[PDB]
Amino acid sequence: DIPKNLEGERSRRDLASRGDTEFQALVEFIEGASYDQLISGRRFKKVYDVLSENDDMFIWLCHTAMSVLNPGDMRSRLIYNHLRILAESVASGEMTQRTAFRFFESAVRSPAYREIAKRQLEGGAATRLAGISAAADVMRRMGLTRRPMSSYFELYQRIVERSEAMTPWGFPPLFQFEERLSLE
């Protein structure tokens, strides 16, 4: 896994003519149904890995939508820009998910925040719609996915599956994100 470097004309030519890799992987898997080949678990693995290339990015976003009580109003340009920037920094590996999340909750919102929160929330849990429309919006306006819908679908799906789980929206602090020991 040595990431190539950008180089002189041939590498840029090869960036240009590149085309869609996600569709190519799929073609190459499917083509195992051709009479002269078999159906390959490796071709499928490569398919899978290109479908899930972002993956964990979505995962991160889930946490920002569902794992935070009262993350302010998520429509306002301010908190929105916080979210945007941190997302673009989870993608492209500039930050750890843990660091980006701890950034997000500790980001600056508004003076006397709790005391303004007493004017809206009882037990301090806001409504989650603004959060999801925001977190889909970011992935759309950031160029995160090749095909537009995938952002919204994945983010939605991953939430709906967790909805059925015992104590769904809380997480152990150590297993929630990247740490030395992890879950299977």
Binding site: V108, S110, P111, A112, E115, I116, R119
Partner: protein
């Protein structure tokens, strides 16, 4: 009257101002403009917590009407005085005598039970309640407990 623009109901605003400006960063007047401005917009300018019923007002609209009938455009205090004198003589049935909500001056105790208890420290309670002071019609021979 637009004397001032800013109003708040938040407890101990002073602390919050302090610690908000602690998290704030640069000194360039753009940064300053925004930080101050954001503070103002979020607390001191009235949106979503507010109502006209709820702000404290002496001149609430009938009072305004009365005032401008009394003191508006009168070129001395004497004019004002015979104007008033002429107004206090109006009956209760006249069209031009208008009522209004009057703000009740609050009592000390606030309830009658409080009145009794307050009264009762200037007094000597009886060892026995009134219904049993008077002896039984039967005779209760007192033993040791």
């Amino acid at each position: 009257l637009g004397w001032t623009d800013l109003f708040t109901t938040i407890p101990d605003m002073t602390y919050h101002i302090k610690e908000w400006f602690d998290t704030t960063e640069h000194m360039h007047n753009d940064a300053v403009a925004w930080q101050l401005g954001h503070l103002l917009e979020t607390c001191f300018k009235m949106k979503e917590s507010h109502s006209s019923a709820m702000e404290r007002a002496a001149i609430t609209p009938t009072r305004a009407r009365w005032v401008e009938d009394a003191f508006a455009d009168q070129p001395s205090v004497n004019d004002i005085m015979r104007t008033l004198t002429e107004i206090e003589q109006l009956p209760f049935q006249s069209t031009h005598n208008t009522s209004d909500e009057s703000h009740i001056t609050p009592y000390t105790l606030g309830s009658v039970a409080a009145g009794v208890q307050r009264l009762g420290e200037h007094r000597l309670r009886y060892t026995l309640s009134p219904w049993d002071i008077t002896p039984p019609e039967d005779s209760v021979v007192l033993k040791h407990t």
